[PDB]
Amino acid sequence: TVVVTTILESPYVMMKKNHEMLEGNERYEGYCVDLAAEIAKHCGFKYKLTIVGDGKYGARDADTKIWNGMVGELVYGKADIAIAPLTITLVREEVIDFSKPFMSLGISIMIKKPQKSKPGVFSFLDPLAYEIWMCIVFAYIGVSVVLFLVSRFSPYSTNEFGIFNSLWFSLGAFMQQGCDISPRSLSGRIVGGVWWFFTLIIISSYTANLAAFLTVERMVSPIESAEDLSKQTEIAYGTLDSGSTKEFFRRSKIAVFDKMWTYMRSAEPSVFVRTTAEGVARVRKSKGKYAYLLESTMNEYIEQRKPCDTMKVGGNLDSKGYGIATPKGSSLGTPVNLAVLKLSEQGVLDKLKNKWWYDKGECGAKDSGSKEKTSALSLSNVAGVFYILVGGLGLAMLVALIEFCYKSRAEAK
Amino acid sequence: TVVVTTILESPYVMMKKNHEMLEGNERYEGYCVDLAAEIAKHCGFKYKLTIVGDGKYGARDADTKIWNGMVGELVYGKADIAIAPLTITLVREEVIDFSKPFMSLGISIMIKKPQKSKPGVFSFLDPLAYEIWMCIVFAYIGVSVVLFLVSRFSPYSTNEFGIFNSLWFSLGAFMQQGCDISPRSLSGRIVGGVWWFFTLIIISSYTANLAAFLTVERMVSPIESAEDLSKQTEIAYGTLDSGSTKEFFRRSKIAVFDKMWTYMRSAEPSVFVRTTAEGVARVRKSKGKYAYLLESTMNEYIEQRKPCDTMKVGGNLDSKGYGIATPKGSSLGTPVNLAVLKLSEQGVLDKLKNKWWYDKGECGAKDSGSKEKTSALSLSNVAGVFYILVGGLGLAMLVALIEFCYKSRAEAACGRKALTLLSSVFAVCGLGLLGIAVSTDYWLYLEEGIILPQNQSTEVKMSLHSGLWRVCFLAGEERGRCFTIEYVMESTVNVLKMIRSATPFPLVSLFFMFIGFILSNIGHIRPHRTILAFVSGIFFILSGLSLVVGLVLYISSINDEMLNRTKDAETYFNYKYGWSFAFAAISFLLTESAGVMSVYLFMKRYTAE
Amino acid sequence: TVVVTTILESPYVMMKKNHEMLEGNERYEGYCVDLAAEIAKHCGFKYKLTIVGDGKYGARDADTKIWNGMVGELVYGKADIAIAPLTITLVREEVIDFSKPFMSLGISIMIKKPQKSKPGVFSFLDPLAYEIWMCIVFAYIGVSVVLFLVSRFSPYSTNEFGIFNSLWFSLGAFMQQGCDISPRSLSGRIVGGVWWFFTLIIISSYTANLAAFLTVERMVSPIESAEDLSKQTEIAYGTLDSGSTKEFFRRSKIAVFDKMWTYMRSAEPSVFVRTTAEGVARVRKSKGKYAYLLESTMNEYIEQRKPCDTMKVGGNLDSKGYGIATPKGSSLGTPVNLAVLKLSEQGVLDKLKNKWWYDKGECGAKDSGSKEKTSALSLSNVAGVFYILVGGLGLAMLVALIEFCYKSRAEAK
Amino acid sequence: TVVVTTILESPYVMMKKNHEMLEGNERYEGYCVDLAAEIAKHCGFKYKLTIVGDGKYGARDADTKIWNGMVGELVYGKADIAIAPLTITLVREEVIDFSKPFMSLGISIMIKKPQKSKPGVFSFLDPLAYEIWMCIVFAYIGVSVVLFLVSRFSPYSTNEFGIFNSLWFSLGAFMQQGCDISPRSLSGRIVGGVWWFFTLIIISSYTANLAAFLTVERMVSPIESAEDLSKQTEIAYGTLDSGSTKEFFRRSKIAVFDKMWTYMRSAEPSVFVRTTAEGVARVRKSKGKYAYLLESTMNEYIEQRKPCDTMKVGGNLDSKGYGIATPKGSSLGTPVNLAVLKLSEQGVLDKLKNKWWYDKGECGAKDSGSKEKTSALSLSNVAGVFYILVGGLGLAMLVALIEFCYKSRAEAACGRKALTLLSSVFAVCGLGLLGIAVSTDYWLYLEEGIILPQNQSTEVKMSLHSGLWRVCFLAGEERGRCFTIEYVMESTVNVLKMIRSATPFPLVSLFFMFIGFILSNIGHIRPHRTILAFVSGIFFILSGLSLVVGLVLYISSINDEMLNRTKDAETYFNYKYGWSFAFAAISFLLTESAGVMSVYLFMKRYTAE
């Protein structure tokens, strides 16, 4: 009767563990297998599934114009019905008829799930912004100068506040340490009064936000909704060859899409890859270097199956449709055409969409909820404080030598 | 000639600077109007534009289902061809003809993009309450004076703690920055000891509650995944009605979408809005209380127009399409259908799709420069700490100039005469302002009332000022009761019983200045045998310590009754201290200062002996 | 045909806002109204709802044996069918027949939702337990004694460490303050070394947990699962009279239930109350003093309708059933009996249970999620630190007087 | 005579101390056995007990539905009356006769009641890592020696910073408790300045991460409401099969219950357990990884028996009933049915229901004394801080006794001779132990492997020790490669490239002691013109500072590669430092100490000049 030309892709058609055990036509299962079984029995015919294992979705090729895989069986007439995740396009439509779309999808960007970032060397000063650390050092100099200028005028023979000691008094006040010298005037002690109140807020502010950083973790979304793709050029975009995602970016006319296809041709080495499962694996080996653009409902499934290290970003960048491919003027097409619309209008198809993607198990708020213990700080989190310390240790020894020069040139005294 | 129907929706159809001056189809301008000329010339028919009367897209009711909108204009024979952002759905597919889609689109949430409220300049002191900072300074004055009275006792040697030193020790101890010297006496170490235990808890409490603010601020997550939009009833969400967004969520078979239509049906008031511009405006007014569901292409254009206060969250919830539509039986429809694809195969659809969208870059790319995700404090957080620091330096220069002038004149009897009279003035003003304050019944205000949400702000229901002896009721039902606390009249009377818990301590403080000033009167007549002045000064110092206990008893007895209200969002609350509270707080300053001066009166006059 | 004797209780039967506007028999609505409409139409008859407004559920009374309310209409035959939230019991069964239960419930304890507690005067020392604050003071004395005994033996004429100063050195080290004296021996400085490391952990530990208290709020469940009821005797239990919850505790035989009925009779003044809505209001005026035991599915509804200040605690303490009451040897009972079981076996009844309680709106994780801003500390939260301070201020003045006694008795020197 | 069938379930049917010795129906004992005698005497029939062969309650399969269990014993005519905790359901109601319920009950979750793990005695230092506390002490030694070399320079007056003072200043500065004196020199203020900035960050980092521990500990909520049980896949939940709990969740119409049966059907392995005792035992073994669904009455009895490690959470999910059952057509059933109600109307049901339940109070009411909800720290949290405090005091007394003896002998040439030789021994041991360490390739261990969940613990897959110059591979596939880092062979090789990033700093440190000891050899021959000894001591002090940079470069380059692993729970990891890491760390201590002694060699011998 009918010969089903299709490919197995999770979760459309899958290979059951009952391969050698269960014989017959129920050895392969999936969302596409039920909808093929629904479309055949409401029409009346019965299915002969066979998967040509070349793997190519297929487009009309360059310089030879050969339909590669499932389309090649469907064009040359060696199979009759094609229930498969196959895209309806213009060059696809002209050779052979199509049904109405299963669901609505788009070209979807797939990346590695963001992790804990590499802690920077100077990442300890993250709780306070750049303008505050400048205004702390600027006010450090300013309060020291005002304390210096105050202490000169007022004797009430030992004025212990030089400009060098006034820097030292305010520095020890900033670092919560005790200083031996104290101001001995009403005009001086007000400077010590407001500067001590300056430190008590800021040091508590640094402790508060650093507690806020370690308690609540917030990971960056590196590339968002394809305008951030257009500017960031450290990542390598990736798509599948012999398919619709190849030819649509070849058909780029939007300026943001024209930026892509220039880089998609001019790149190294992944101009294209050959399997979505290879593309899933290439993302998981990338660790942020590479992204693989693919079908949206394919992208949604891999994020729900639980290695959990993949993330769909933004939204769809196109609109495409999965329809039952049929020969041009099919023996079965118009009965399939109404019965595809019949399953949609009573929500059996959307129930099948609810069925297959939900039952596989989820990776959502369940692991983000209570699979965290907050880690101890590593050496990397506070590494630069050691470098400033030992860098201060070497710089102190350098000024020790320049002191020996100026002390010895007391010579000819 | 043909008829072209449109809906007045930005940016597809726009108005003109010559809204009434200009002629013909050139009355309007827009993406669809430019698209309609493209459909016209390639096919070969002149077009006359028309407008739908109602301004709604298309509605199918449980009814005779005459579509109220552009569709019924298009079906029943008023109009010929529609050039509009009409959504292609299967319900509309069976009743009219659609071409291939000329644009790709989806449902997208538009929320109010959160304007950062730059906080108060003095927002650093928000972890503590303003009553606490009042009680810290009241404790700072008291510990300095008590350490003065401990140190400067009558047989005391080499005890350097004057009042200027005792003020400087407690300020150094409170800031944890060390100090010059330590008290070399057993009672001096006790007052230093409890103050060290005081400053340990308060700074640790301030650091911990400031950590409590910043963790709760980071735990707040903006709603973007549309499951957060479904589960958060604090943000209300509605759609444009008589369209396709209302149709999509109605017959949906996604469980999160099912709860959305369940919410949007049974919501009150009717969240459905008949036009997009008012639906944008409800997001603007609500300040993030309301959200709006619409197409993605409309959401992007409203974003890049410049109020720049609306952002798109999440992604396309589905992928529908826009298509030029003709009724069943139109001979023009198949020449229309290939003409749309003809404009597709040269990008003339996509050239116009770029043109109106890039040209409105009037927003200045606010999204480009304001999404660097940063949770560090800004200078707007700790601004007043710099402002106190600047105000301290300019004050200290002002003290430096007056000290420079006063020292030159002094180096180029007065102490005894002026200080005796000035402490005498401070004693009467201290006793009098508290005696007014206990008599006055304007201690605390309350304004219980009920909130009002939208087009609607607030409504008071009850008000009373209050006193320590007796209540005196206010403009709630205009009942002028000075009704005693023993005489009842709820939670507000429960406050009034708890106000009575702090009754004796001001009356105890009133007695100690009363014995304080009268013993001050005795030494003013006869200066000799000078013991009584030092005794009287102790009664001044111990008086203010009781009033510190009096205020701390009073304020804590208000704050728990504030907390004791069952927290309903609809019943707002107000409370405020009064002039007599200021009369008592000022009387604390005059009483302790007269306590210091009367010891200096003893120090000068024991030398006179 | 049939006359429905029942009472309106939310959400069983409710009064619609379309009272004067909508006439006919749809002026009252609810879960019980649908199930009455389901049981009547599958049997064939049509309903005449009328609510005898006396309010009593009714039991066979003391000393007169009168069936009070809905049972009185059902016993004396002035009404025929009774679709109502009525409990099936022995004395109920003997006079008139009953159907199979709607749902399964129990006697359920209802309390005020716990709030922020009153902060204690000495609640500042909550982050560290009782054993630590003893071991801090015990080690405060111990390290001071060891520092005292060390400094006596080693000159390398001015031994500045007395027992009084050694207490003062370790106290200033505990309070993060700077002390003027310093140890001047290797045996002494080790004592200052480990004591300084003692304070740095503990003061940071106090700051860390007090931040943990203010960030995460955790409110006590005061009384849990009816054994904590049996021991706590500051709360007043409450039930409704003229009903099943009255008579079941009268039928107490379990020892934990025998504790209840002694207190339920011997109390003041709420031995019983007269309305569940009065009992809901009495809990909301109680603020923790009083609890109202009631029907479980009634208790579940009030917690979902949103004043939100009620909480069901623990679990059910009994099992009871809501059935359609029928006359003894009813004209309709056995057709009702099968059709009650018919609605249960195909889950229409459980769908009606899903319908009415869910649609009213919820008060769950939605307000606990993001309707919190953490408050500023009040004066009450740190109140006792002021009392210890001013209590230290008065105690310092007392030792100032006892110093004057011992100084003046240097007399006869 | 009649036949009575039972299931061996606690506490309803129990065994006997005479398991085989005693005779008849008295072979067993229990609540149902005592209930069966009550049914016997009031009706008037003698009873013979029997046991079901399988031990399952009752199963209805999609099958011929012969009930496999006590029901099929009761239906088909093997047994007459059942006295058992059989649940009354509508499926069982149509096939046999049930009396009125004699007990009320519900489904209740039993989880493992969490045993508190009393933490490590030194668990206070858990916010930082043990590499950090190693680097703090390494920085503490270095800053003290550098401040010594800065202060004790050759023309220096009155500079009191000896090495015993410089050790005491940095310890006072690190603990933020103030200090005795401050460095009165410009280079001395620099080394004090960066150390003050060091101790500011580390203490604030320790306080913040300790706050991070206690907030995350409080955010963990135990699963009790059964919606948390449904949504948390980390705790697996299953039921007793062939009963009524399996039947109830199967055909349920509650949406949270629907996901439960969806989970319990498709779970792997089969969570259904054929007996309750093994179903209790799976909760015991899993240590809170597994949960069990059962009746409330069985859950309470297992709780009050004393392992006391199982608690009940939530409430009764429904309210089913237990009833004495007879088949259809039993003449005894209506005399049975009124006899159950006869025992109800005297509480004889309820008297027996009290009796077995109060008598097993062997648990000692663990729930009564362990649910005072308390989140304060215990002494078990900060225990080692007391233990360090106790160990410090006993050490200080030990220093006090030896100082008392040494001072008496000394008060009742030696410095120059001993210190010169001891620094010479320390120099060779410092250079030699590092030279072994650079040569040795046992720096760091790794054990990559895969976990195993249950009846199953761990399995290694790969192992390698490693060196700075070259790797030397280990028992992963038994391949003895001392394969150089330039020669590749994944994430573990990515570690090996990052180990090479810290290569020069130990080799730089190896050169500086090599120039250090040789310049030390020159002064040993000729003491005169003593400048070179002070120069050589600087090369010792600067050598250890480079090795501090060498270790900090090395340790940070390991920790990020630890973090760089994609975190899979199934692939566990191990890492550990080696003997050569200890050889380098010990060599730091000898190098800085010889740096101090060679300055003292200069201080003594400049006095000799």
From Swiss-Prot, chains B, D:
Tissues in which the UniProt entry reports expression: Detected in forebrain. Detected in dendrites of neuronal cells. Expressed in the pyramidal cell layers of CA1 and CA3 and in the granule cell layer of the dentate gyrus.
Residues involved in L-glutamate binding: P85, T87, R92, S244, T245, E295
Induction: Down-regulated in the pyramidal cell layer of CA1 in the hippocampus by global ischemia.
Origin species: Rattus norvegicus (Rat)
Lipidation (S-palmitoyl cysteine): C179, C405
The record's account of how the chain is modified after translation: Palmitoylated. Depalmitoylated upon L-glutamate stimulation. Cys-179 palmitoylation leads to Golgi retention and decreased cell surface expression. In contrast, Cys-405 palmitoylation does not affect cell surface expression but regulates stimulation-dependent endocytosis.
UniProt-annotated site: Crucial to convey clamshell closure to channel opening, residues: I223
Topological region Cytoplasmic: 180-185
Cysteine disulfide links: C308-C363
Protein name: Glutamate receptor 2
Side Extracellular, residues: 207-381
Residue list for modification Phosphoserine: S252, S286
Assembly with partners or alone: Homotetramer or heterotetramer of pore-forming glutamate receptor subunits. Tetramers may be formed by the dimerization of dimers. May interact with MPP4. Forms a ternary complex with GRIP1 and CSPG4. Interacts with ATAD1 in an ATP-dependent manner. ATAD1-catalyzed ATP hydrolysis disrupts binding to ATAD1 and to GRIP1 and leads to AMPAR complex disassembly. Interacts with GRIP2. Interacts with GRIP1. Interacts with NSF via its C-terminus. Interacts with CACNG2, PICK1 and GRIP2. Interacts with GRIA1 and SYNDIG1. Part of a complex containing GRIA2, NSF and NAPA and/or NAPB.
Protein family membership: Belongs to the glutamate-gated ion channel (TC 1.A.10.1) family. GRIA2 subfamily.
